[PDB]
């Protein structure tokens, strides 16, 4: 919900994903490089607030221009036995060894967009042509050619 669009690059099975000490594997891994240039801090704040809410069984209130601060959410998260900033010690799926860097980890609301690759893939060797110009027709639905 913060303009962070992307496409699936590869799918790993349950046993190939990194896991935390309590066995939680992520559903989805995004690159750290998406954050600094675009400055979507709201993404990180939403992840932290959602983590606290799912731990405590509440729904976070992310209304803008309120008195919510990151430190209050961090205190709540620390009181529940997690690192206050949301980091987690995470293990490597392939070898089982600990990762040297801790991983920001939590639930976030994602939405699936209408643009799927199977509705865009198109190839043409030969096919219908226009009557006037005898050049390939236009359109993926009509088995057309590329300009």
Residues in 4-23 that interact with RNA by CB under 7 A: 5
Site for other proteins in 72-101 (CB under 8 A): 72, 76, 78, 81-87, 89-92, 94-101
Angle between helices 70-79 and 41-56 (to 10 degrees): 40
- 77 contacts which partner out of other proteins, RNA, none, CB within 5 to 8 A by kind? none
- Binding part of the chain for RNA, among 17-25, 72-80, 103-111, 128-136 by CB under 7 A, reads 128-136
Please, is 73 exposed, middle or buried when counting C-beta atoms within 10 Å of its C-beta (0-12, 13-18, 19+)? Answer: buried
The rounded distance, in Å, linking the Cα atoms of 13 and 107 is 19
111-145 exposure pattern, b = at least 16 Cβ within 10 A, e = fewer? eeeeeeeeeeeeeeeeeeeeeeeeebeeeeeeebb
Of 97 and 120, CB closest to RNA? 120
Q: Does 142 bind RNA (CB under 7 A)?
A: yes
CB 51 within 8 A of CB 107: yes
Site for other proteins in 24-63 (CB under 8 A): 24-33, 35-42, 44-63
Of 86 and 144, CB closest to RNA? 144
Locate tokens 């750290």: which residue?
32
Of 69 and 130, CB closest to RNA? 130
Binding site for RNA (CB under 7 A): 5, 115, 127-131, 137, 142
């Amino acid at each position: 919900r913060h303009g962070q669009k992307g496409t699936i690059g590869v799918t790993y099975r349950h046993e190939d994903m990194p896991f935390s000490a309590e066995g939680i594997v992520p559903d989805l891994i995004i690159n750290p490089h998406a954050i600094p240039s675009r400055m979507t801090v709201a993404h990180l704040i939403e992840c932290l607030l959602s983590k606290v809410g799912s731990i405590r069984g509440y729904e976070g209130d992310a209304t803008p221009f309120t008195d919510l601060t990151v430190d209050a959410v961090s205190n709540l998260l620390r009181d529940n036995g997690y690192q206050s900033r949301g980091f987690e010690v995470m293990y490597n799926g392939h070898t089982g060894k600990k990762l040297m860097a801790q991983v920001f980890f939590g639930p976030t609301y994602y939405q699936r967009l209408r643009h799927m690759v199977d509705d865009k893939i198109h190839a043409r060797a030969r096919g219908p042509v226009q009557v006037l110009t005898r050049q390939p027709v236009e359109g993926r639905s009509r088995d057309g050619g590329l300009r």
